[PDB]
């Protein structure tokens, strides 16, 4: 018949443990994209050195987070620039 059992099934486990070096870095990423995409992971599994399991799932509870109502926001749109460049001959 078959093989057997040929291992169990995976379990899950939550990972409430990162540094302020990896940290600095998933939260500077999931800020721009809140959601993660193959591409972005696989810059932050260098960075931060952790797995795409893990990176991914950190990206996801964040957002839980924002749901809160957060303190006060600013209106104050970020402020533009400009240049010039005259000329002569």
Do not use: C, Y
């Not at 099934?9 to 990423?29: C, G, I, M, N, Y």
């Amino acid at each position: 018949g078959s093989s057997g059992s040929s291992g169990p099934d995976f379990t899950p486990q939550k990972f409430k443990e990162k540094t302020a070096e990896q940290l600095r870095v998933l939260q500077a990423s999931f800020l721009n994209s809140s959601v993660l995409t193959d591409e972005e992971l696989n810059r932050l599994r260098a960075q931060t050195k952790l797995t795409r399991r893990e990176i991914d799932a950190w990206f996801t509870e964040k957002k839980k987070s924002k749901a809160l109502k957060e303190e006060k926001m600013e209106i104050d749109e970020s402020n533009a620039g400009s240049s010039s460049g005259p000329s002569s001959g």
